[PDB]
Short mmCIF file of C-alpha atoms and ligand atoms in Angstrom, two decimals:
data_model
loop_
_atom_site.label_atom_id
_atom_site.label_comp_id
_atom_site.label_asym_id
_atom_site.label_seq_id
_atom_site.Cartn_x
_atom_site.Cartn_y
_atom_site.Cartn_z
CA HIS A 1 -130.22 -15.78 -15.57
CA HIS A 2 -128.86 -12.15 -16.46
CA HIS A 3 -131.62 -10.01 -17.56
CA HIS A 4 -129.37 -9.40 -20.70
CA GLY A 5 -127.69 -12.04 -21.78
CA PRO A 6 -124.49 -13.23 -23.81
CA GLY A 7 -125.14 -12.39 -26.85
CA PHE A 8 -126.73 -8.77 -26.93
CA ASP A 9 -123.97 -8.17 -23.93
CA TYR A 10 -120.99 -9.57 -26.61
CA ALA A 11 -122.63 -7.48 -29.59
CA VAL A 12 -122.37 -4.42 -27.42
CA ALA A 13 -119.05 -4.71 -26.11
CA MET A 14 -117.86 -5.06 -30.43
CA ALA A 15 -119.90 -2.16 -31.40
CA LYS A 16 -118.88 -0.21 -28.81
CA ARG A 17 -115.50 0.03 -30.29
CA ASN A 18 -116.16 -1.64 -33.62
CA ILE A 19 -118.21 -0.31 -34.98
CA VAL A 20 -119.14 3.30 -36.56
CA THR A 21 -120.96 5.27 -38.90
CA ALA A 22 -119.72 6.37 -42.09
CA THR A 23 -121.36 7.93 -44.84
CA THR A 24 -120.27 7.54 -48.45
CA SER A 25 -122.29 9.10 -51.21
CA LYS A 26 -124.56 6.51 -51.23
CA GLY A 27 -125.63 7.64 -47.55
CA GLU A 28 -124.93 5.97 -44.14
CA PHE A 29 -123.24 2.86 -43.62
CA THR A 30 -122.88 0.84 -40.33
CA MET A 31 -119.19 -0.14 -40.56
CA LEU A 32 -117.13 -2.39 -38.61
CA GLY A 33 -113.33 -1.56 -38.15
CA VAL A 34 -111.78 -4.73 -37.95
CA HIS A 35 -107.97 -3.34 -37.17
CA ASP A 36 -105.38 -1.41 -37.11
CA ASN A 37 -107.36 1.54 -40.50
CA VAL A 38 -109.04 -1.33 -41.77
CA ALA A 39 -112.87 -1.68 -42.27
CA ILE A 40 -115.65 -3.21 -44.50
CA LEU A 41 -118.59 -1.86 -45.92
CA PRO A 42 -121.15 -3.36 -48.39
CA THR A 43 -119.33 -2.61 -51.70
CA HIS A 44 -122.78 -1.06 -52.64
CA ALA A 45 -121.39 1.71 -50.20
CA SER A 46 -119.15 2.86 -52.79
CA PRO A 47 -117.07 4.60 -50.84
CA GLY A 48 -114.94 6.73 -53.12
CA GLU A 49 -111.65 8.89 -52.17
CA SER A 50 -113.25 9.70 -49.06
CA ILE A 51 -115.84 8.38 -46.56
CA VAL A 52 -117.66 10.54 -42.73
CA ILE A 53 -117.02 9.25 -40.07
CA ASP A 54 -117.80 11.41 -37.23
CA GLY A 55 -118.31 14.48 -39.19
CA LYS A 56 -114.89 15.00 -40.26
CA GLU A 57 -113.96 13.63 -43.91
CA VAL A 58 -111.89 10.24 -43.63
CA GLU A 59 -109.03 9.48 -46.47
CA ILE A 60 -109.52 6.01 -47.81
CA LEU A 61 -106.11 4.41 -49.04
CA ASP A 62 -107.69 1.60 -51.35
CA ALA A 63 -110.42 0.12 -51.57
CA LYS A 64 -110.90 -3.92 -52.68
CA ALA A 65 -114.23 -5.14 -53.75
CA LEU A 66 -114.12 -9.02 -52.81
CA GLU A 67 -115.13 -11.88 -54.93
CA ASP A 68 -114.55 -15.77 -54.49
CA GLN A 69 -112.45 -17.97 -56.57
CA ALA A 70 -114.88 -18.29 -59.84
CA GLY A 71 -115.00 -14.00 -59.35
CA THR A 72 -117.89 -14.40 -57.88
CA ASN A 73 -119.12 -10.61 -55.92
CA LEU A 74 -118.88 -11.49 -51.65
CA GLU A 75 -120.11 -7.77 -51.36
CA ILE A 76 -117.71 -7.05 -49.43
CA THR A 77 -115.58 -3.92 -49.90
CA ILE A 78 -112.47 -3.41 -47.13
CA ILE A 79 -111.15 -0.36 -47.15
CA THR A 80 -108.01 1.50 -45.63
CA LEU A 81 -107.75 4.75 -43.57
CA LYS A 82 -106.21 7.56 -43.45
CA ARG A 83 -105.28 7.67 -39.94
CA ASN A 84 -104.08 7.51 -36.92
CA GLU A 85 -106.10 6.04 -35.08
CA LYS A 86 -106.50 1.92 -34.63
CA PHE A 87 -109.41 -0.34 -34.71
CA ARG A 88 -108.86 -2.78 -32.02
CA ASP A 89 -108.01 -5.62 -34.01
CA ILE A 90 -111.40 -8.32 -33.56
CA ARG A 91 -109.33 -10.32 -36.32
CA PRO A 92 -109.50 -13.70 -33.88
CA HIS A 93 -112.95 -13.02 -33.25
CA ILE A 94 -114.28 -13.72 -37.07
CA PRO A 95 -114.35 -17.12 -37.78
CA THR A 96 -112.01 -19.19 -40.01
CA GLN A 97 -115.12 -21.14 -41.59
CA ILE A 98 -118.19 -19.42 -42.67
CA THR A 99 -120.51 -19.82 -39.13
CA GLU A 100 -124.07 -20.44 -39.06
CA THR A 101 -125.76 -19.75 -35.75
CA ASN A 102 -129.19 -20.73 -33.80
CA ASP A 103 -129.00 -17.16 -32.14
CA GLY A 104 -127.92 -13.96 -34.15
CA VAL A 105 -128.11 -10.53 -33.64
CA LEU A 106 -127.81 -8.09 -36.55
CA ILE A 107 -125.98 -4.47 -34.91
CA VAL A 108 -127.46 -1.66 -36.57
CA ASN A 109 -126.04 1.78 -36.07
CA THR A 110 -126.64 5.23 -38.04
CA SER A 111 -128.98 8.41 -37.48
CA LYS A 112 -131.95 6.37 -39.52
CA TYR A 113 -131.46 2.71 -37.22
CA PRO A 114 -129.39 4.47 -33.60
CA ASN A 115 -127.98 1.74 -31.56
CA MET A 116 -130.17 -1.07 -33.03
CA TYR A 117 -129.70 -4.48 -31.60
CA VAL A 118 -131.83 -7.37 -33.07
CA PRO A 119 -131.74 -10.89 -32.04
CA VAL A 120 -132.65 -12.51 -35.46
CA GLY A 121 -132.71 -15.83 -34.82
CA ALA A 122 -131.21 -19.07 -37.11
CA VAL A 123 -128.83 -17.48 -39.20
CA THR A 124 -127.71 -19.93 -42.15
CA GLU A 125 -125.10 -20.57 -44.92
CA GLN A 126 -127.37 -19.82 -48.18
CA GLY A 127 -124.89 -19.28 -50.85
CA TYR A 128 -125.17 -17.80 -54.45
CA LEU A 129 -128.12 -15.39 -54.16
CA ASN A 130 -129.14 -13.16 -56.84
CA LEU A 131 -129.80 -10.06 -54.68
CA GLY A 132 -132.19 -7.77 -56.52
CA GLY A 133 -129.61 -8.08 -59.59
CA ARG A 134 -126.32 -8.40 -58.00
CA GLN A 135 -125.00 -11.75 -57.98
CA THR A 136 -123.53 -12.63 -54.93
CA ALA A 137 -121.92 -15.37 -52.88
CA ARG A 138 -120.91 -17.17 -49.76
CA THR A 139 -123.47 -15.31 -48.21
CA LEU A 140 -126.11 -16.21 -45.22
CA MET A 141 -129.61 -15.62 -44.42
CA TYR A 142 -132.51 -15.34 -41.37
CA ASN A 143 -135.82 -14.84 -40.92
CA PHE A 144 -135.90 -11.09 -40.11
CA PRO A 145 -137.88 -8.29 -41.81
CA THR A 146 -134.61 -6.51 -42.72
CA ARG A 147 -134.31 -2.98 -44.60
CA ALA A 148 -132.65 -0.11 -46.84
CA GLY A 149 -130.53 1.80 -44.48
CA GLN A 150 -129.09 -1.65 -42.32
CA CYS A 151 -126.46 -2.88 -44.66
CA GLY A 152 -123.07 -2.83 -42.88
CA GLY A 153 -125.11 -4.10 -39.96
CA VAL A 154 -122.61 -6.28 -38.44
CA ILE A 155 -123.91 -10.46 -37.68
CA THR A 156 -122.86 -11.13 -34.61
CA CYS A 157 -123.09 -14.43 -31.71
CA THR A 158 -121.86 -14.66 -28.48
CA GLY A 159 -118.15 -14.65 -29.24
CA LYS A 160 -118.31 -14.13 -32.74
CA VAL A 161 -118.26 -12.24 -35.59
CA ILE A 162 -119.88 -13.96 -38.49
CA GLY A 163 -120.98 -11.90 -41.05
CA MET A 164 -122.30 -8.35 -42.64
CA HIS A 165 -125.49 -7.63 -43.52
CA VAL A 166 -126.01 -6.75 -47.12
CA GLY A 167 -129.47 -7.37 -48.29
CA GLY A 168 -133.42 -8.38 -47.50
CA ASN A 169 -136.36 -9.24 -49.52
CA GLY A 170 -138.82 -8.21 -47.52
CA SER A 171 -139.11 -11.51 -45.04
CA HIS A 172 -135.66 -12.24 -44.80
CA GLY A 173 -131.92 -10.37 -44.21
CA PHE A 174 -129.03 -11.75 -45.99
CA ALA A 175 -125.20 -10.90 -44.96
CA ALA A 176 -121.70 -11.47 -46.52
CA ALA A 177 -120.11 -14.55 -44.15
CA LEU A 178 -116.87 -13.45 -42.42
CA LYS A 179 -114.05 -15.52 -42.30
CA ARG A 180 -110.82 -14.03 -40.42
CA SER A 181 -108.72 -14.99 -43.74
CA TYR A 182 -110.32 -12.00 -45.39
CA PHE A 183 -108.20 -9.52 -43.25
CA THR A 184 -104.83 -12.26 -43.08
C1 K36 B 1 -128.76 -2.18 -47.58
O1 K36 B 1 -128.41 -1.48 -48.78
C2 K36 B 1 -130.23 -2.32 -48.17
C3 K36 B 1 -130.69 -3.75 -47.59
C4 K36 B 1 -131.73 -4.71 -48.21
C5 K36 B 1 -133.32 -3.66 -48.59
C6 K36 B 1 -134.24 -4.16 -48.55
N1 K36 B 1 -133.52 -5.34 -47.51
C7 K36 B 1 -133.03 -5.40 -46.84
O2 K36 B 1 -132.33 -5.66 -46.29
N2 K36 B 1 -129.85 -3.96 -49.67
C8 K36 B 1 -130.14 -3.81 -50.66
O3 K36 B 1 -130.70 -3.26 -51.52
C9 K36 B 1 -129.58 -4.47 -51.80
C10 K36 B 1 -127.70 -4.22 -52.40
C11 K36 B 1 -127.38 -4.90 -52.92
C12 K36 B 1 -126.83 -4.63 -54.76
C13 K36 B 1 -126.55 -5.72 -52.49
N3 K36 B 1 -130.16 -5.89 -52.62
C14 K36 B 1 -131.81 -6.29 -52.07
O4 K36 B 1 -131.61 -6.37 -50.79
O5 K36 B 1 -132.73 -6.21 -53.00
C15 K36 B 1 -133.81 -7.39 -52.52
C16 K36 B 1 -133.55 -8.70 -53.03
C17 K36 B 1 -132.98 -9.38 -51.79
C18 K36 B 1 -132.47 -10.69 -52.63
C19 K36 B 1 -133.46 -11.19 -53.10
C20 K36 B 1 -135.13 -10.35 -54.31
C21 K36 B 1 -134.55 -9.03 -53.77
#
């Protein structure tokens, strides 16, 4: 087998064109660009009227904090950027279903955690979880000691973008599940 396996190669290829580092008033977050001018951040990143990407202020046209049908926070905020550059459309890589895997990779890219690729192993649906005081729905859980600064990180498996890191309790990490219908 190749030294660098399919999960890693997929993560790196996804990151190169669809992950940027965004700075809000709450600091730097890994940020997935989904299509056109649409990206996602952890809701607690609290994007304001603008964010910094690549040292430049980029206006935010809209920010939509996602909730499930019962009103429960999903901890995903969809933001729309005022700029002409379009993100490679990766919607086809986002599953229609909340998706588990035996082999997930957490992708983080900030000045604190530059080019971080971690195979977190099993990614399992958890559902409703109180994340340190923030009630959250549709979470995924992995057994890896994630830390502050990694939120916004992308969870992938080969061929799919399945979650966005939002929390952790010391020994485990938690992601907001991604579904294609969020972006269509
Ligand atoms: C990223 O901003 C950060 C990542 C956490 C920090 C510790 N390890 C991580 O992976 N997310 C949070 O700090 C987060 C923000 C909420 C408003 C969603 N809350 C959090 O992770 O609380 C800790 C906790 C999680 C689950 C059960 C009990 C406590």
